[model samples]
Target: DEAREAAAVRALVARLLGPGPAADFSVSVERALAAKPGLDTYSLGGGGAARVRVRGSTGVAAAAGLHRYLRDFCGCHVAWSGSQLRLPRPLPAVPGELTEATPNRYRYYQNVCTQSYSFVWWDWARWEREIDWMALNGINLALAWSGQEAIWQRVYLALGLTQAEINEFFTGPAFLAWGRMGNLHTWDGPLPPSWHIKQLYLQHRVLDQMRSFGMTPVLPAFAGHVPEAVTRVFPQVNVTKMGSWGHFNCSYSCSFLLAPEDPIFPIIGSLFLRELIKEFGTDHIYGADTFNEMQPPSSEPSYLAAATTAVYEAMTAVDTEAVWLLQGWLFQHQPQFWGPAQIRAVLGAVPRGRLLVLDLFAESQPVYTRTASFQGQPFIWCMLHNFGGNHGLFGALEAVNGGPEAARLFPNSTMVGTGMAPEGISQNEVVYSLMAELGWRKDPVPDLAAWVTSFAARRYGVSHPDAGAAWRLLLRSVYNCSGEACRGHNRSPLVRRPSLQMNTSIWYNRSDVFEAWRLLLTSAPSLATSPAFRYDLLDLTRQAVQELVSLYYEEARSAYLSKELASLLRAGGVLAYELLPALDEVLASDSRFLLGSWLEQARAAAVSEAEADFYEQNSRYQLTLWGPEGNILDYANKQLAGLVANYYTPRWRLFLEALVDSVAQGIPFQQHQFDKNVFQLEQAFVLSKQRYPSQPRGDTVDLAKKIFLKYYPRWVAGSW
Candidate 1:
């Protein structure tokens, strides 16, 4: 029994840290003394020797126990950058026992949009590190659909689709997730054939590592989306056209769908699944969203019921034990379209053991509470935090920390797991850590004040008083707000379309956020050397300065109305120009906020000049224009270093110059003309061949401190 446990622990350690570290530590089993699976207690002795007594059945849980020990007791944490593990100041005389258990049967990670928002251009090396991080954080189920287009190509070609026709069905990497959802198709250049081959090779490694870590990677299944050419070739088939999604252009609108009952549906499904498992074997869990953001073919109960059941049957037809994993975003996104009767008809179509639903908006608007616990079918309660991977300091701490336990008590609740389903993970570290911590506990999480204290200790490797106090202030401010709008909730107004009336987003507590920023700045002198501390300092200062856009906006509007050019010059001209450079300087203090970090990764992974430009365009458009020379602008605006300096800075300058010149000449400003000019400038930025270093270019603490002092009174007082 102990031998099995030790072997499981060994595999996880060797994969994540390496052989030396895995061999350095030893694991033992205490069968009779355990309360739950994957629960472990650890003790550290002299000479860098550590022993773990684990009560776990899976390697994922074993790694969780090890990481928890390293974090909770040793104050050692492993981040994307590197590890921080050091022997205790003085070795303890006795064994230190710590016990924790996972209340939820599953812990999930990743969002559908994450495939485009952040991971559009990730290389195999990046995927390896990210998967390793997921295992360490106790994630047992992840959305894995890489190399899927390659499989689809094979299936379509066998089904009599020409090479040109197959290419027309595929989309660019940045737009693949939505393309898979059956929302849109064929906007970004018929997706290069080389990409299909490259992704196929990468997916093999993805599945191998995921299986090796004891994770059940959710593979893809057909959802009845077909190429437009299908109608021309197969004249007898029933092909249904659907409405457009998002703000995508007309050329990318209304992908064709086939009814589940159609003869060709199962044939397509069987071919895709047969080839899918052939290339990448699965553990029976398949992620299939029939109508993610689109309307169903019909509203009739019979149509809804048969649609889902047929999808499941098609899946189980190939793999008898297949469990269809569906995202419940549509339930929240289009509530009117899916009332209780409609939802029941669709979800209840599948049998209990054969289906699992993801309550995609558990923190804000959980479908479990609406569907009577998804009508008793097992579902994962997931937090849809931070849409579009947009940067921000926002979360509902009270809701996220305790929401799972609350759902667990609901009548008919059969919630099986807790998970982090944010579209992006690089920002708002506090939210992700709390979500991971919530996975191991059956009851409501601990008090926020106490949790923030320990977070400061582990994040910086020492419990500095100033750092602890700073996080406590954050818990009461930025992390405590509640806003459940679209992805626009996290976007800052300064970087958004310039408007006097809409300088802030739909909902935010400016007073509380500024107060948190002021308190965080007070800790600079003591925690300046700490990387975690410095990064947050830079982030807080950037938000504080950008938060002043509204004030300057109001001043410019007032001066324009009153015909006072001097007031406009002082309020908007002289001070407003400093916003971009100041924010850029603060961001340049850290590599994480640099635009170069994102673009350089895209550059290093490209195989040719054409591929390099393709990667660059994918990276650039996703954060700015988000489409092909269209009205889809500012959908995923981020406040990165090179972006602020190179892209946003020039855009804002042209806008302000026009406003100032118009006011001086006593001519009314035309919004339409200025917008057209801004669009032209944005298009140029996206098409530029400029390159930037992929590392920090300035001192973070120095610039943050300087920016804070300069913008303190004006930014802070305006909120009051």
Candidate 2:
């Protein structure tokens, strides 16, 4: 227990004595571990020492409980292995403890964070702050899946595969649809004629990031991408006998199980291992993600064992220093799909410490706490506290790792971390901040309030009085933010009734919406110029604006769904599209070009085809719905139509010219029709100027507009 306390003290000391800007930015903290302390608990003068908790029977767990366990009883900042469990330095102390009344003082720390889970198109703002968080928070591991083109080129080049073939293995920008397609786009889909190069590229990028971060590269499993490697080389074995995973297609040819009994398993594993060592050196962790999100127990045992064994053999062929990290998703996500026998089958043959299991969504199911150790191996509880995936639209915070869960299960051997997460980490990255505090301490938990204040002061560079106000706003806003699903903050109830007599619902209750905006807008001044901050605020407001706009709609069938419709019934609604002008101003004026592009896209997407008849019908929708308007949507679409004619009009005209030269038997280009082709090719002229802000203005929107014009004709109104 003293070890825990000492660890916490050291972690705090490390931060206190660490680097400083040496300017007005100069700051420091100090603490010491004192005697007269038990392993389970300790008291330091001036709040200097760490709180350490001992692992006891269930009695100790219950007696200490969760809240008291971390605060009053057992608390630590660092783990025995030197990884920080939580922030160690002291916070400006709070006044009360454990009072359960109104305006209670005993709250650990408040964190009203955003929960955006729309990562299918989300981008994690690449920043050094993320790197600092990883190192300081005791997270020595991470998954970096960006920029892997180099690896693909190297591996496939060695295989003598042409770039065309390599490209065939990858999909385009729309592959996001594959992930979201649920069961449709699988590993077995027809290769995009260039998938191989893309996969290798992706792998290379991920490896580079991992190497930079001092984390291991968990390469895309060999068969996960190319299952047929088993059959082509190991014909002596029964390839067909091994089962198939869920609905798969034979795209780049579905990667299949390499028979464990087949000699090719070791051969291929050895090859990849040698290449990996050659490229990145043997110092990094080696990972083979044999199983992904799909459930496997239901698959034929032959395929199941073969699939996992392929990985085991691959890891074994390499140096023992390499730790084989598994995503454990197949087992974690679909428990009933795979039972103990299947798990044992996979782990049984692999070396013990050499293997790392990542409990992907462990927060969703706490049973992995004890069950993970059942195999007697070291498994890290990768706490994905963010809403699943990197989208900026999360609904809830998932942190079963708070308090004693890590100590209770993994004890000194847990490396809690996050995975493919959001564009920005929450302001209340407190659970992680606090847990890291515990890592250096011998105690199981520490006083979070104390740490929060210290952090706020440093983060915002505020004095005690202002710091208190900021922390108070932050805490009540998100730390313990609770209400309905997706109601983490006030913007609106997530699921609103279609037509209420006086509707005001969206993601959260009104109070939550108020607090969300209030907290965010209040916090904006600290980072008003920061693009990242601005983007985050815009996202928060997007939620708010979406909600505020909803208040105008009486029903789904009413004018609410269509902006054009709502405007037709001028002044009847409470607000006249408050966000449109704001969005327009931000888009046209903000130096950040993408905001303008997104605004443009949103505008284009919002246009209704029926509006083409606006002049004929004498509709007032455009004027009423989006006031202060020169028909922004109409003008934008008009430009799009002109863009198409300027570019593709010529290309199609040329094609028709070529068709006129066809002979009797030639099916060159059916000359019967005089219709204009919307595009010369897909995606070429389809891209919008605003969509690709970096794109030269020499572009056409016709091909792209044609796609939506089929439905929203107003957007395709010729050059008007």
Candidate 3:
């Protein structure tokens, strides 16, 4: 078994680095003499021809050990955004035997919304890289929710529902996360048949890869959410209609929920779980959130306990070792509804250690500490840093660096692990990397300043004073935000709907960000060749410009109130014509931030041209209007190249003209009329078949310098 495990990790190494470097490292798996529960221990020793020998308790541990060797010994790093893997020839030798182990039993990953926010359009190649990153980061438990829709379709059809009912029940491919959680349905659907086939095959490959590395993949389970057509099939089934979700009306919202006492409830839940496991083998863990953002029909403790018991029993019927993974978001989201009585009733219904609760937003709003660690049920300390996958440099560094250990050491603590449950991914690589290291670390980082300095050196492959200074400045500012503002809702005026009264409050000091931008640009001449360096440079520059937009917005707002047409024109001109376009230019120069790449990937997943158009519409809708009638508009905002130049810029220009005309004529600006015109523009962009370039266009360093030189003086002088 150890040999087989070692072989699997060796293959993973070959995939990351080529065969030559992979051959230079020998991997072995063995059990420790006195191992803790889920303990992963790794030791590195000098070898003969293989320069280094990596020994571990499991495949995941061995792979993590290899990553340790790469980052610390070789000055190499890997991340979701980019990696620096420039190994010196002949390979670095191990100075002596080195050993490390994780005290935590688990390192979990993913959020329920991460499926819709980031992984909606991912292919196997992208997933392959992500799984590799997960292993290297010591993550063993991850959500595998790719093809649950296909299983749902089967369960519904087998229960005498027509294909039409199933079609209307499932949302579009991009919006399945909500549909899975029973939030909204038929908004962007009917989902294509090709989508089901594609997802099923994708999940197969995904599970295979994850299992090969001895990682546990969490699968979806029934949470008592069913289509309305179920009422017609089984009229006697007791069910309650949920209220509207996220401003959606009764048509797309109000999902049907079955009462736990109903005889058909277990039948439906057990049938779904049986078919799910038969189709895709399970790791005995299932994720089910019956009240994710939706209020329960009754707040009585009995009702809540019944709901939990029924969902867990359905899983245990199929697999005796079933462990229900619950999201603790509902408790934090609706505090009044989920009081101590309701929380204890729901959690106490299940056996201890059988239900694992993810204290989903532990970094900002920890529900565990308030609920006494879920009243003894095992829970994970999670950092839900990013929301809606919005782009902004954000983190709770002080919390993350010390939060996990604090939770672990809590009196009578049932905290089992540390997790990262970002709603989206691919931004803030530094925060995620640091969190990963903390998962394996036994204690808090003694000196975060030194840790960040070392992180910068390994991230860029070489450490320069200017680069190190820029990171140190960032660590104390943008990445060190706490309180409510630390919750990563990128509320820049650049991405928000235009309004005279807008909130541009930031938790960090704007001057610190300005200085960090200056330092990063100053080091660009020396660090320009590094990809990660270039990405960080562009990100810092983008953040500075984003902060500047707020200043210009304030100036325009003041000008409008004062009825100063000339001042409004000057401020609005720079915002609508010059600064916004500059943002688009810098974003377009980096392929990672291009809107084109996102749209293209959605289209590429299509089997037909019509399907391609449908997929593209889903992509466009999610980023802009977010609904048929802009119900949740600008909620999932991104500052992409094409979007800024087309969508955001045009909206600002219309607003500016309306403001100017109002000032010149001494008439009040009509909000209703402006909205009508803006809605037309937003709808037209969603319908248009325009294509953007996937490859980057301009020079990143050049764009950063241009923006800095143009704005730094005005910014420092406090002139709008």
Candidate 4:
């Protein structure tokens, strides 16, 4: 076992660092200390030939040790967005012997929506990089819901359901998360057969890589979401129609849920899980959220208990060591429906330690304090910071800095671990890095000031005062929102549909961001060579410009309300033509923010050109329009290069023109007509076969400078 574990760590080293540098590292694994159960420990010491010797309890722990040595001693860092791994010549010696161990039993990763929001189009190479990142971060538990649909097809076929029914039941590839949750079906799809095949292959590689690092991959289990054809095949199968979800009507929403008392429930559930196990071996942990966002037919304790019992029974029938991983989103989402009695009924049905719950939004609204740590069932305190993967610089730094420790020290605490449950990833790197370090730390970061200072030093390979100061400002402002300010989705006017009464209320001080933007731009001269610095420069610049859009919108709205044509013309012209284009230019300078990359990844996953077109449509639809008639529109909106200039700009232009005409001619603005016309424009963009560049253009630092100089003065003067 040690040999196999060391080999995995060696392979990981070869991938992250080149083969030449990989030769300098030695990895070994030993049995964990008996006193600490489920403990992952690592130590770094000097080796022969000026090499680094890393030892741990598992491959993941060894990789974490290697990463720790790199970050703390070598002044190197790695993140989802970018990295700085320039090691010193001949390698640095480990002072004495450095050792670290995780205080928690597990380190979990991923939210169900993360599969759709950020990972829907990833290829194997992308996944390989991500898995390596997970191991380095010490993550051991992750959600693996990739190719279950392939097994579901087999189950449906064996149960006598035709391909047509199966196709209709499945949503598009990008919408599979909700489809699996029994929320919506066939919204933007007839998932192609090629998708299933490719995903099935990807899943095998994905699970193998994860398990190689001694990580526990949670596979999907059936949750009573069957096709309508099930009722046709078994007429006596008791089922209830769920209410429409997210403004969707019965046509696309209202999924059928089988009654837990129905004997056929376990029959179908076990069959699907058995096939899944046979196809891709299990880690004995299964994920099934029966009512993720949907309300049950009844809130009675007995009814709720039966539903969870049935779900757990399905897993145990297939794997005797099955542990059900449930997302505690329903209780947080619908507070009224899930009172104390209902919450306990659902969680208490299964024996303690047999089920694990993810307190999905612990950083913001921890359900544990009120639920008594899921009524003594084990749970993980998780940070769900980002929503829909929207590009915005946001964090609950104060909460994340102290939240886990508080949860761990809660009276009669049953919190076993910490986790990241973001709906998306690759946006906020600092927040994640901090959370990852907290997993192994015995105490909460005593001084966030000192922690971020070290973070800045490792992030760019050297610490410049300006860059460090910029982070300090960012830590106090953009990353400090708490309570009501940090709750719910991102409502920034820059990403929302153009409107007169848009929500431009941000909790943090605007001047702090402006000052941080200035600091970052000033530091570009010294930090220009660093990729992470360049990305941050562009991100801060984009956020600065994004903040300006709201000011102009407020100006134009005020002008229109007062029927001042000249004022409306001035504000609207600058917003639609000047400021919006500047935002696009900054985003276009970095390939990471390119809309083309997302679309290209989707097309690349396709087996044929026709399938590519279908996949591309799924990609476009998810970003804009979202549904047939704008239901949940802009929910997954991204501030990408091509989208900012083409899609968002045009929509704003139309809104401006409508407002301008209304003000000049003394006619009231028609909200309904504007919505209808905007929907058409959105649909057209989805249908158009336009291609954008995957590579970046222009200089990030220079573009940021241009945007800052133009907007900084206006912000200072408080002039719209």
Every candidate's lDDT: 0.76, 0.35, 0.88, 0.88
Index of the highest-lDDT prediction: 3
Q: Residue-wise lDDT of candidate 4 within 163-213, one digit each (tens)?
A: 899888889999998999988988888888888888998899999988888
Ten residues in sequence with the least summed lDDT for candidate 1: 40-49
Per-prediction TM-score: 0.93, 0.54, 0.98, 0.98
Per-residue C-alpha lDDT of model 3 across residues 393-485, encoded as one tens digit per residue: 888899888899778878888998889999889889889988889888888889887888888898888788888988998999988987654
Give a tens-digit lDDT track for model 1, residues 118-229: 7777889889878867867888899887888888889888878899987877777777888898877886756776777778878888887777666789999988888887
Q: How many pairs of residues collide in model 4?
A: 0
RMSD (Cα, Å) of candidate 2? 15.7
Question: Candidate 2: global Cα-lDDT?
Answer: 0.35
Candidate with more favorable, higher TM-score: 2 or 3: 3
Count of backbone collisions within predicted model 2: 94
Worst 10 residues of 3 by lDDT: 31-40
Number of clashes in every candidate structure?
2, 94, 0, 0
